[PDB]
Structure 1
Amino acid sequence: VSVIAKQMTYKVYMSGTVNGHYFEVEGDGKGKPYEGEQTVKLTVTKGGPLPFAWDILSPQLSIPFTKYPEDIPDYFKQSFPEGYTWERSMNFEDGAVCTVSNDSSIQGNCFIYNVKISGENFPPNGPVMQKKTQGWEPSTERLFARDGMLIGNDYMALKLEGGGHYLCEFKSTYKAKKPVRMPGRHEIDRKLDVTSHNRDYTSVEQCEIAIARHSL
């Protein structure tokens, strides 16, 4: 898909506010876009240490690195070099809500992501503000096309200290900056893991695998 090489890097800039706490994050990532493998190294650049669970941030930190089979049009890769934007809602089980937006573009063999996040109404003694989360379970996002955009839906779960999970609904709208060949209904199977962190989570490393496939 041309503008996109077998081996790509990326820069992500993230900023936002969670329960009134302002922060900024910067990351340098790298991966194999046609293999769906990705890794990124993150630094909390303002407002650290964060008084909330790192995990709510991890999934806002790279869709062109999704392995698409030949028979499903790759909406994200096609959008380049112009790029795309998206809006996401995360609706957690205890009433907390996160809204996220992104703008993506490209500089040669390096993507640039500008991510913004607003997280409100996490209970002060809940697992997010008390840092009791221990990573996301693997998940499968289901996507369909509407008016030239992709609409995604994913029921996610955060692992908790001393067992059990904290459940979340993701709803995402992805919008390419120019018309592309539209896929049908499909889904993307992903596993996201923090592979490395320092004590206060001001330096984090993450890896993701993402694999697109037909839906049933």
Structure 2
Amino acid sequence: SVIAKQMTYKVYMSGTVNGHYFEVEGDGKGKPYEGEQTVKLTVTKGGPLPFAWDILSPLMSIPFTKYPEDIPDYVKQSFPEGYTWERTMNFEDGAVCTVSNDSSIQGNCFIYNVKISGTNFPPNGPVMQKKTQGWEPSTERLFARDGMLIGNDYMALKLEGGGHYLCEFKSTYKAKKPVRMPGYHYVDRKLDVTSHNRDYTSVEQCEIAIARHSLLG
């Protein structure tokens, strides 16, 4: 097993949202087998960002998911060779982000290369007016198809003054070598911003991610 009980990672993010180019670099660590991690992000280009930080936070570490012994762990099995993923984020006011990731390993250090293209955020909307206050806890539905893992997740941003702003995640995770596939299952997650400077050009995040069966049956 190339995945130690304690691990670090580096994330390199680049892309455009509503035509605004930026780069973010991150240093993370955690306990992959406990589904616990933390990351320090720096906006290295195009900060301060003109859009809500929250739209980037779930793009900056699926090896840090607690899997029980009876549910094959697609992502961890992929190492050392690693995996890629693609994701679409469909926001309820019509905006879309497309994201691609390539993940690899270097000693005790995962390396994530992530690219985002986001468009059609209304200038009106809570993303460009920064009215978001973090994501609700969520549950990804996962199942195996043609040797890839398909993920779906109904995510929701909390809005300044009470309501929610919805975002549908669709994810395709692809190991760079075939691995043992899981059955139909779920991952419960909780993602929080745990620190920031005033303009969110320096940010830290905590995540907890635990796989499980369906609760009923």
Partner of 2:69: 70
Runs (4+) of structure 1 moved beyond 6 Å?
none
What is the SS of the residue equivalent to 1:115? strand
CA displacement at 1:63 relative to structure 2 = 0.3
Give the distance between the partners of 2:23 and 2:79, measured in 1 at CA.
26
CA deviation after TM superposition for structure 1 residue 118, in Å: 0.5
C-alpha distance in 2 between matches for 1:36 and 1:144: 19
1:128 corresponds in structure 2 to 127
**How does the TM-score come out when normalised to structure 1?**
0.99
- Distance in 2 (alpha carbons) for counterparts of 1:214 and 1:147: 21
* TM score, norm. by length of structure 2: 0.98
- How far apart are 1:13 and its partner, in Å? 0.3
Task: Provide the rounded CA distance (Å) in 2 between the counterparts of 1:93 and 1:56.
Answer: 13
Structure 1 residue 125, shift from structure 2 partner: 1.6
Q: How far, CA to CA, are the matches of 2:113 and 2:184 in structure 1? A: 27
Percent identical across equivalent pairs? 96
RMSD: 0.4
Q: Following TM superposition, by how much is the alpha carbon of 1:55 offset from its aligned partner in structure 2, in angstroms? A: 0.5
Match of 2:152 in 1: 153
Distance 1:21 1:183 in 2: 39
CA deviations on 1:161-212 (whole Å, 9 max, x unpaired) are 0110100100000000000011111110000000001100000000000000
TM superposition shift of 1:47: 0.2
In structure 1, the gaps of 5 or more residues are: none
Uncovered stretches (5+) of structure 2, i.e. residues with no partner: none
Query: 2: distance between equivalents of 1:111 and 1:186?
Result: 25
Q: Deviations over 1:92-139 (max 9, x none)?
A: 000000000100000000000000001000000200001110000000
Within 2, Cα distance between the matches of 1:49 and 1:125?
19
Partners of 1:166 and 1:181 in 2: CA distance: 36
- In 1, Cα distance between the equivalents of 2:129 and 2:198? 15
Partners of 1:82 and 1:186 in 2: how far apart?
24
Secondary structure at the aligned position of 2:63 is classed as helix
Q: Kindly tell me the number of residue pairs found equivalent between the two proteins.
A: 214
Aligned mates of 2:81, 2:89 — CA distance in 1: 27
Instruction: Give the corresponding residue for 2:201.
Output: 202
SS of the residue 2:54 aligns to: helix
Distance 2:27 2:167 in 1: 27
